[PDB]
Structures are given as C-alpha cells and as structure tokens.
Design an enzyme around this catalytic site. Structure first.
Site, short mmCIF file in Angstrom:
data_model
loop_
_atom_site.label_atom_id
_atom_site.label_comp_id
_atom_site.label_asym_id
_atom_site.label_seq_id
_atom_site.Cartn_x
_atom_site.Cartn_y
_atom_site.Cartn_z
N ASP A 198 0.81 -1.24 0.00
CA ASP A 198 0.00 0.00 0.00
C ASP A 198 0.85 1.29 0.00
OD1 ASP A 198 0.88 0.10 2.60
OD2 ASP A 198 -1.10 -0.59 3.40
N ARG A 258 1.13 6.79 0.13
CA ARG A 258 0.30 5.81 0.86
C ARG A 258 -1.12 5.80 0.23
NH1 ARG A 258 -2.68 2.58 3.18
NH2 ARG A 258 -2.38 1.75 5.27
N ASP A 291 -5.66 -1.09 3.64
CA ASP A 291 -4.54 -1.56 4.44
C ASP A 291 -4.19 -2.93 3.92
OD1 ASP A 291 -2.73 -1.26 6.62
OD2 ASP A 291 -3.94 -2.59 7.79
N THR A 292 -2.98 -3.05 3.44
CA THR A 292 -2.41 -4.35 3.09
C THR A 292 -1.63 -4.97 4.24
OG1 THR A 292 -0.46 -3.23 2.07
CG2 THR A 292 -2.30 -3.90 0.62
N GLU A 311 1.58 -6.28 6.12
CA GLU A 311 3.02 -5.94 6.02
C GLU A 311 3.72 -7.12 5.36
OE1 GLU A 311 4.11 -2.80 6.77
OE2 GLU A 311 2.13 -2.26 7.61
N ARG A 342 4.08 11.12 3.71
CA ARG A 342 3.63 10.32 2.55
C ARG A 342 2.43 11.00 1.92
NH1 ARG A 342 2.73 4.54 5.40
NH2 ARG A 342 1.16 5.86 6.35
#
Ligand SMILES: Cc1cn([C@H]2C[C@H](OP(=O)(O)O)[C@@H](COP(=O)(O)O)O2)c(=O)[nH]c1=O
Ligand SMILES: [Ca+2]
Length: 129
Positions: free
Chosen positions: A15, A29, A34-35, A37, A75
């Site tokens: 992401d 971002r 939300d991906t 980690e 970001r």
C-alpha cells in the site's frame, strides 16, 4: 476529483509506492486501504500485486481526495491508477487489502471500495479465505 500525472520511481509494498509527482520523488500511501506488512500473511502477495500493476502500467496517475494530501510521515495520500485502473480498488477486489483508515473528508471512493471488499469476501479470496 482529478487524475494527475506521475511516473513510477519504485514499488515498495502492498500500500506504498515511490512516484515522481510534479517532478519530485514522493512516497505515496494508498487511501482507504490496508495491506498486510511484507512479513505477514498475504504481505508478499499484496506487494507483488501492486508491483506488477504499477511496473506494467504505461500511464500512472495520482488522484488526491478533498482532504489532507500528505500524512504525518510526509507520505502523499492518494488514489493511484495504472492505465486507468485503481490500484487501491484492485487490491481490495482481490482480497489482498481491507478497506481501512477511512477518515472523514478523504473518503470519496469509500463505497466503491466497500463494494469490492464485499465481492472479495463472497469469493473467499486470499485474506477472506
Ligand atoms: C491510510 C492513512 C494512514 N495514515 C496514518 C495512520 C496510521 O498512523 P500510525 O503509524 O500511528 O499507526 C498510519 C498507518 O499507515 P500504515 O498502514 O502504512 O502503517 O498512517 C493517515 O494518517 N492517513 C491515511 O489516510
Ligand atoms: Ca499496511
């Protein structure tokens, strides 16, 4: 909302992505997702998916929402498109990201993404398997 040009500098993970925007390198971002980690389950697969989408694209575009354009880490916060297809949405649709971090005023594509998540979940894809 308006699409603006950018060029890939490099894929980072599920992401986040390094792009050149108005001539300056920036980490972006992805809004509203939300991906996992890289070290978590489906993390590698999210990264690979995002990477492929952006590396194969001819035209990368950045679309800011109505709110903050940079986060507290500096970001950029945007919807990112690869040949007209939204990476944020494509990750969700494939069960490689969850709809997340929905803040009021930078949430234009919330319902679009939630529709994608519902289909990913129906199909029991990846995260929802
Ligand atoms: C997606 C997004 C994340 N963030 C911040 C919230 C989280 O703060 P914390 O670092 O305090 O948890 C963090 C999540 O990003 P990551 O999922 O990349 O870690 O980034 C925003 O502020 N705005 C956003 O739109
Ligand atoms: Ca993450």
């Amino acid at each position: 909302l308006h699409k603006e040009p950018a060029t890939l500098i490099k894929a980072i993970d599920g992401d986040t992505v390094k792009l050149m925007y108005k001539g300056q390198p920036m980490t972006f971002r992805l809004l509203l997702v939300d991906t996992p980690e890289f070290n978590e389950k489906y993390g590698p697969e999210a990264s690979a998916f995002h990477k492929k989408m952006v590396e194969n694209a001819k035209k990368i575009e950045v679309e800011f929402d109505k709110g903050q354009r940079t986060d507290k880490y500096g970001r950029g916060l945007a919807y990112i498109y690869a040949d007209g297809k939204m990476v944020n949405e494509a990750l969700v649709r494939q069960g490689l990201a969850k709809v997340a971090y929905v803040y009021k005023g930078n949430n234009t594509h919330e319902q679009l993404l939630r529709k994608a998540e519902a289909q990913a979940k129906k199909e029991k894809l990846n995260i929802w398997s």
